[PDB]
């Protein structure tokens, strides 16, 4: 077929994709800036395609509803033919790789703990042995599903608490989780990916920090519909960008060169 503009689904999540100040009424890709915006430009160049950045309609990463068996978020957009590719902080997981294809990882992360500075918590075990400090995760993402499915003793115990805690410990966006930590006086800790944690740790008002080691080890990958023609080239482009050091360069650019806390 004739070359067609590739539809990219992505999500407003700092510093991966952000609306440039005062660009709301402009058009096309120029509106957006961030790590995944730069990455999408590089992938498209190496693979020889034109593309259109679109923000996922429901604002979600992607999970399969236990009732309807329907995939939501960016995963859903790929599964149901609404997008050709997802270029986003989308976590590689077993259940997702059954239904979509992931490139090799372009960024590593693990689930980590965000506290307000001074909170007397150092580890997941610390969280699980007390009741004074509440803790939760993002909705419809891999962190929540990790805890839901884990047989690891401490994580199972944490899930047992989180899934029935009232009011809900879950949040709709990373921004909401961070705000909840910052306004909790130390009484809420947020479980999120180390990448996002370390980004926020470098943002004013510099009142949060990542504590303890990561709970797991995984990565983000570029995702395409199962058996898509783009998969092979996209996979090779990620590995080329990795070996060239461009992925390291983009991370320093968006995390640390832009650091506001020293």
Ligand X SMILES: N[C@@H](CCC(=O)O)C(=O)O
Ligand Y SMILES: C[As](C)(=O)[O-]
Task: Please report, as ranges, the residues that interact with ligand 2J9 according to CB under 6 A.
Answer: 92, 104-108, 217-219, 239, 242, 247
Interface with ligand X (CB under 6 A): 61, 89-91, 138, 141-143, 192-193
- Interface with its own copies (CB under 8 A), residue total 28
- 142 annotated ligand binder: yes
DSSP states of 130-192 as a string?
Answer: -SSSEEEEBTTSHHHHHHHH--SHHHHHHHHHHTT-SS---BSSHHHHHHHHHHTTTSEEEEE
Q: Which stretch binds its own copies (CB under 8 A): 12-20, 165-173, 181-189, 245-253?
A: 245-253
The entry of ligand X, its own copies, Zn ion, none that residue 151 binds, CB within 5 to 8 Å by partner kind = its own copies
Q: How far apart are CA 134 and CA 189, in angstroms?
A: 6
132 binds, among ligand Y, Zn ion, ligand 2J9, none (CB under 5 to 8 A by kind): none
Q: Which stretch binds Zn ion (CB under 5 A): 7-15, 85-93, 170-178, 179-187?
A: 170-178
Q: Which is nearer to ligand 2J9, 114 or 247 (CB)?
A: 247
- In the chain the beta strands, taken as DSSP E runs, fall at 6-10, 18-19, 32-33, 51-55, 85-86, 100-102, 107-109, 111-116, 134-137, 188-193, 208-211, 218-220, 223-225
Q: Is 160 in the site for ligand Y (CB under 6 A)?
A: no
Does residue 15 have a cis bond before it (omega within 30 degrees)? yes
Closest by alpha carbon to 171, among 215, 140, 142? 140
Told to check if 16 binds its own copies by CB under 8 A, we report: no
Q: Which stretch binds Zn ion (CB under 5 A): 34-42, 101-109, 172-180, 186-194?
A: 34-42
CB 208 within 8 A of CB 181: yes
Give the whole-angstrom CA distance, residue 120 versus residue 143.
23
d(CA 148, CA 163): 8
Q: Which one of 130, 160, 229, 244 is in contact with its own copies (CB under 8 A)? A: 244
Report the partner that residue 24 touches, choosing among ligand Y, ligand 2J9, its own copies, none (CB closer than 5 to 8 A by kind): none
Among 3, 4, 68, 94, binds its own copies (CB under 8 A): 94
Task: Report helix angle 153-162 to 142-149, nearest 10.
Answer: 110
Determine which residue in the list 168, 217, 229, 232 makes contact with ligand Y, applying CB under 6 A.
168
**Looking at 67, 243, 257, 260, which residue binds its own copies (CB under 8 A)?**
243
- Strand order from edge to edge, sheet including 111-116: 134-137, 188-193, 111-116, 208-211
Q: Does 252 bind ligand Y (CB under 6 A)?
A: no
Q: What residue numbers does the annotated binding site cover?
A: 89, 91, 96, 142-143, 193
Q: What residue numbers does the annotated binding site for L-glutamate cover?
A: 89, 91, 96, 142-143, 193
């Amino acid at each position: 077929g004739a070359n067609k503009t590739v539809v990219v689904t992505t999500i407003l999540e700092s510093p991966y994709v952000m609306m440039k100040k005062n660009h709301e009424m402009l058009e096309g890709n120029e509106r957006y800036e961030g790590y995944c915006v730069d990455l999408a430009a590089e992938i498209a160049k190496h693979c020889g395609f034109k593309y259109k950045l679109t923000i996922v309609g429901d604002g979600k990463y992607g999970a399969r509803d236990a009732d309807t068996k329907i995939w939501n978020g960016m995963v859903g957009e790929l599964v149901y033919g609404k997008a050709d590719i997802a270029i986003a902080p989308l976590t590689i997981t077993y259940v997702r790789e059954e239904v979509i294809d992931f490139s090799k990882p372009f960024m590593s992360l693990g689930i980590s703990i965000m506290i307000k500075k001074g909170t007397p918590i150092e580890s997941a075990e610390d969280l699980s042995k007390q009741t004074e400090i509440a803790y939760g995760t993002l909705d419809s993402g891999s962190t929540k599903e990790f805890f839901r499915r884990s047989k690891i003793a401490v994580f199972d115990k944490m899930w047992t608490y989180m899934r029935s805690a009232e009011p809900s410990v879950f949040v709709r966006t990373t921004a909401e989780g961070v705000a909840r930590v910052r306004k909790s006086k130390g009484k809420y800790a947020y479980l999120l990916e180390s990448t996002m944690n370390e980004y926020i740790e470098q943002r004013k008002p510099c009142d949060t920090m990542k504590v303890g080691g990561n709970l797991d080890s995984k990565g983000y990958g570029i995702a395409t519909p199962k058996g898509s023609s783009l998969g092979n080239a996209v996979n090779l482009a990620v590995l080329k960008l990795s070996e060239q050091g461009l992925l390291d360069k983009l991370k320093n650019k968006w995390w640390y060169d832009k650091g506001e806390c020293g």
